[PDB]
Design an enzyme around this catalytic site. Sequence first.
Site, PDB file in Angstrom:
ATOM      1  N   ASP A 127       0.834  -1.183   0.000  1.00 53.16           N
ATOM      2  CA  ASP A 127       0.000   0.000   0.000  1.00 53.16           C
ATOM      3  C   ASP A 127       0.881   1.249   0.000  1.00 53.16           C
ATOM      4  O   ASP A 127       1.906   1.293   0.685  1.00 53.16           O
ATOM      5  CB  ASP A 127      -0.898  -0.050   1.241  1.00 53.16           C
ATOM      6  CG  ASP A 127      -2.137   0.776   1.097  1.00 53.16           C
ATOM      7  OD1 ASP A 127      -2.032   2.003   0.914  1.00 53.16           O
ATOM      8  OD2 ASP A 127      -3.226   0.183   1.161  1.00 53.16           O
ATOM      9  N   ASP A 129       0.090   3.925   1.310  1.00 53.58           N
ATOM     10  CA  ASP A 129      -0.250   4.663   2.523  1.00 53.58           C
ATOM     11  C   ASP A 129       0.367   4.086   3.779  1.00 53.58           C
ATOM     12  O   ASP A 129       0.031   4.543   4.870  1.00 53.58           O
ATOM     13  CB  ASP A 129      -1.776   4.703   2.725  1.00 53.58           C
ATOM     14  CG  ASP A 129      -2.490   5.562   1.695  1.00 53.58           C
ATOM     15  OD1 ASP A 129      -1.834   6.410   1.082  1.00 53.58           O
ATOM     16  OD2 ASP A 129      -3.705   5.387   1.490  1.00 53.58           O
ATOM     17  N   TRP A 189     -15.310  -6.087  -5.484  1.00 55.74           N
ATOM     18  CA  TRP A 189     -16.174  -7.018  -4.752  1.00 55.74           C
ATOM     19  C   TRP A 189     -15.747  -7.156  -3.299  1.00 55.74           C
ATOM     20  O   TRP A 189     -16.592  -7.298  -2.404  1.00 55.74           O
ATOM     21  CB  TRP A 189     -16.116  -8.384  -5.439  1.00 55.74           C
ATOM     22  CG  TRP A 189     -17.007  -9.469  -4.883  1.00 55.74           C
ATOM     23  CD1 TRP A 189     -18.271  -9.328  -4.396  1.00 55.74           C
ATOM     24  CD2 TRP A 189     -16.693 -10.865  -4.786  1.00 55.74           C
ATOM     25  NE1 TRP A 189     -18.761 -10.551  -3.990  1.00 55.74           N
ATOM     26  CE2 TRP A 189     -17.814 -11.509  -4.227  1.00 55.74           C
ATOM     27  CE3 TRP A 189     -15.566 -11.630  -5.111  1.00 55.74           C
ATOM     28  CZ2 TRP A 189     -17.848 -12.873  -3.993  1.00 55.74           C
ATOM     29  CZ3 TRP A 189     -15.601 -12.991  -4.877  1.00 55.74           C
ATOM     30  CH2 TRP A 189     -16.742 -13.601  -4.330  1.00 55.74           C
ATOM     31  N   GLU A 192      -9.821  -9.658  -1.921  1.00 55.42           N
ATOM     32  CA  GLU A 192      -8.656 -10.122  -2.670  1.00 55.42           C
ATOM     33  C   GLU A 192      -7.509 -10.497  -1.740  1.00 55.42           C
ATOM     34  O   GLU A 192      -6.787 -11.465  -1.996  1.00 55.42           O
ATOM     35  CB  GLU A 192      -8.224  -9.067  -3.687  1.00 55.42           C
ATOM     36  CG  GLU A 192      -7.609  -7.794  -3.171  1.00 55.42           C
ATOM     37  CD  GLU A 192      -8.660  -6.709  -2.840  1.00 55.42           C
ATOM     38  OE1 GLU A 192      -8.265  -5.582  -2.520  1.00 55.42           O
ATOM     39  OE2 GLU A 192      -9.870  -6.982  -2.898  1.00 55.42           O
ATOM     40  N   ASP A 193      -7.336  -9.770  -0.634  1.00 51.96           N
ATOM     41  CA  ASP A 193      -6.240 -10.105   0.269  1.00 51.96           C
ATOM     42  C   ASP A 193      -6.516 -11.418   0.999  1.00 51.96           C
ATOM     43  O   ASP A 193      -5.594 -12.212   1.232  1.00 51.96           O
ATOM     44  CB  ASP A 193      -5.974  -8.972   1.264  1.00 51.96           C
ATOM     45  CG  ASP A 193      -5.491  -7.673   0.587  1.00 51.96           C
ATOM     46  OD1 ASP A 193      -4.936  -7.703  -0.531  1.00 51.96           O
ATOM     47  OD2 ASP A 193      -5.672  -6.593   1.174  1.00 51.96           O
ATOM     48  N   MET A 219      -0.154   4.653   9.063  1.00 52.96           N
ATOM     49  CA  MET A 219      -0.937   5.049   7.895  1.00 52.96           C
ATOM     50  C   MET A 219      -0.719   6.532   7.633  1.00 52.96           C
ATOM     51  O   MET A 219      -0.724   7.341   8.557  1.00 52.96           O
ATOM     52  CB  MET A 219      -2.427   4.765   8.119  1.00 52.96           C
ATOM     53  CG  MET A 219      -3.345   5.229   6.986  1.00 52.96           C
ATOM     54  SD  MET A 219      -5.090   5.171   7.420  1.00 52.96           S
ATOM     55  CE  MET A 219      -5.825   6.030   6.032  1.00 52.96           C
ATOM     56  N   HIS A 222      -3.537  12.970   7.978  1.00 50.03           N
ATOM     57  CA  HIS A 222      -3.360  14.146   8.819  1.00 50.03           C
ATOM     58  C   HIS A 222      -3.536  13.782  10.283  1.00 50.03           C
ATOM     59  O   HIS A 222      -4.377  12.954  10.654  1.00 50.03           O
ATOM     60  CB  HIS A 222      -4.365  15.250   8.471  1.00 50.03           C
ATOM     61  CG  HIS A 222      -4.351  15.659   7.032  1.00 50.03           C
ATOM     62  ND1 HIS A 222      -5.334  15.280   6.142  1.00 50.03           N
ATOM     63  CD2 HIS A 222      -3.473  16.411   6.325  1.00 50.03           C
ATOM     64  CE1 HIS A 222      -5.064  15.781   4.951  1.00 50.03           C
ATOM     65  NE2 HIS A 222      -3.940  16.471   5.035  1.00 50.03           N
ATOM     66  N   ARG A 224      -4.950  15.399  12.653  1.00 44.66           N
ATOM     67  CA  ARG A 224      -6.314  15.574  13.145  1.00 44.66           C
ATOM     68  C   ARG A 224      -7.192  14.362  12.836  1.00 44.66           C
ATOM     69  O   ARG A 224      -8.251  14.190  13.458  1.00 44.66           O
ATOM     70  CB  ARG A 224      -6.936  16.849  12.547  1.00 44.66           C
ATOM     71  CG  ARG A 224      -7.742  16.642  11.257  1.00 44.66           C
ATOM     72  CD  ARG A 224      -8.314  17.962  10.712  1.00 44.66           C
ATOM     73  NE  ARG A 224      -7.264  18.958  10.508  1.00 44.66           N
ATOM     74  CZ  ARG A 224      -6.548  19.095   9.395  1.00 44.66           C
ATOM     75  NH1 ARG A 224      -6.769  18.318   8.341  1.00 44.66           N
ATOM     76  NH2 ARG A 224      -5.606  20.023   9.339  1.00 44.66           N
TER      77      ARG A 224
END
Length: 277
Positions: A127, A129, A189, A192-193, A219, A222, A224
């Site tokens: 990912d 992120d 859908w 997948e993982d 992750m 921000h 906040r």
Amino acid sequence: TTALSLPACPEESPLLVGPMLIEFNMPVDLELVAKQNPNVKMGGRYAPRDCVSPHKVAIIIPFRNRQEHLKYWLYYLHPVLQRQQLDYGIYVINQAGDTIFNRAKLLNVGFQEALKDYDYTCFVFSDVDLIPMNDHNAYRCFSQPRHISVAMDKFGFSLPYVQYFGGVSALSKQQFLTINGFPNNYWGWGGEDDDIFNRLVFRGMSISRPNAVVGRCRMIRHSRDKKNEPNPQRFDRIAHTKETMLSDGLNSLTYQVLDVQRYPLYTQITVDIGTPS
């Protein structure tokens, strides 16, 4: 006269620093990042000068419209991957167009396209992120399939379920081929993982994990917006995976590469992966 080939790199790198402070309150200048990482060569490629790493790693990021997040990712991960003494390259697989995102298909694209560049034998699927908080969490492969992002701050540093395989994982070339890659048919859908996990244990494998302190990840969000998300429930896909894993995978991977960019810190592959049809 006699030449000496380089030594293989040690099992354990001596450059690791351990835990790291990961924050997102500062802008990233990718040109500065390149200047501060001068050994990273065009296309986001690096290998140690002093030794021959056993870890030939393509890091594959499925992507669409997340440039600012990608900048943080490059800023944090390039220093870690160098310290881990990896022979590595960064691949951002960018889904062209505005149809439903198909994460696993883009991961499969990255596997195949990365192999056209180099004899990689390990694939890290990440990912964009997720950033590791400890550089002892190895971004490379193991004798078993490896789940890297085991304790994510967005889930309270808890593992959602023992079979959870989301976020960041590493598979060897062999592990990936044994399972016929990843499913292409999930689209939006869900699951997948979990499908990938099911593939791996149907093929006799047992997921390896760093310990939960080393495997903490942040992750990108921000400050906040910091909060514990609900832990995801497992998608019920075991019987489905068993039925379809040999008919959906590398042997059904349909795509067209539209353009490739070798930027200083990463290779971007923009692809048309078709439609849920």
